[PDB]
Design a protein around this ligand. Structure first.
Ligand SMILES: */C1=C/C(=O)OC/C=C/CCO[C@@H](c2ccccc2)[C@H](NC(=O)[C@@H](NC(=O)c2cc(C)on2)C(C)C)C(=O)N[C@H]1C[C@@H]1CCNC1=O
Length: 181
């Protein structure tokens, strides 16, 4: 097997989880230790269903920028035995565009799903259902509901978490390594 498929299948295997909150199904990315990230609008409660079992959330941190604008990412710390494979090395130090990126979705309804989004490019401000959002990026692919939390990647580098769309374009919250320090 080639390398870009291996990396994506490895992600699926040890870092990308099927989850359910009171808001529906999402893809969850485990980053390291007991630390994971979800789209802010998944609104994780005191517990979250992960794959096959209810897992308690010890702490949740919705990220905003330095003038307090939404970044659309929640950092959750899980009460689990498992430590995630530390993938913080694959996350750039600053938000990074990409070409020929792939969106990795993993949900009960959309399991192990690989979506050839295009090049990924910058955006900044997004109006997502009345929530103004910064540090977002864009890909000209018609993503759809149920794909939030999906992992944007290209060439072994984890760069965004899918958060929204419009039927012709998809938008992710950019990832940077300092979020997970
Ligand atoms: C991802 C998750 C999903 O389907 O779930 C259920 C959705 C619940 C409602 C909340 O999710 C919306 C949201 C995101 C961030 C902050 C607040 C709310 C989100 N909203 C949208 O994507 C909407 N689009 C826009 O507002 C918009 C602005 C610009 C510019 O372009 N689009 C909505 C589609 C009108 C949401 O539903 N995200 C959802 C994935 C998208 C559904 C449609 N295509 C997607 O990629």
């Amino acid at each position: 097997m080639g390398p870009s498929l291996d990396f994506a299948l490895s992600l699926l295997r040890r870092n990308v989880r099927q989850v359910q909150t009171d808001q529906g199904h999402f893809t969850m990315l485990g980053v390291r230790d007991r630390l994971a990230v979800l789209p802010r609008h998944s609104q994780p409660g005191k517990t979250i269903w992960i794959e096959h079992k209810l897992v308690n959330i010890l702490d949740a941190v919705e990220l905003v920028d330095e003038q307090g604008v939404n970044l659309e990412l929640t950092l959750i710390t899980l009460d689990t035995n498992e430590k995630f494979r530390d993938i913080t090395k694959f996350i750039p130090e600053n938000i990074s565009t990409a070409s020929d990126a792939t969106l990795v979705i993993n949900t009960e309804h959309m399991p192990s799903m690989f979506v050839p989004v295009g090049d990924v490019v910058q955006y900044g401000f997004l109006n997502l259902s009345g929530k103004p959002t910064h540090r977002t990026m864009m890909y000209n692919f018609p993503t759809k509901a149920g794909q939030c939390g999906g992992v944007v990647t290209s060439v072994g580098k984890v760069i965004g978490i899918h958060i929204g769309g419009n039927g012709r374009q998809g938008f992710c919250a950019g990832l940077k390594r300092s979020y997970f320090a």
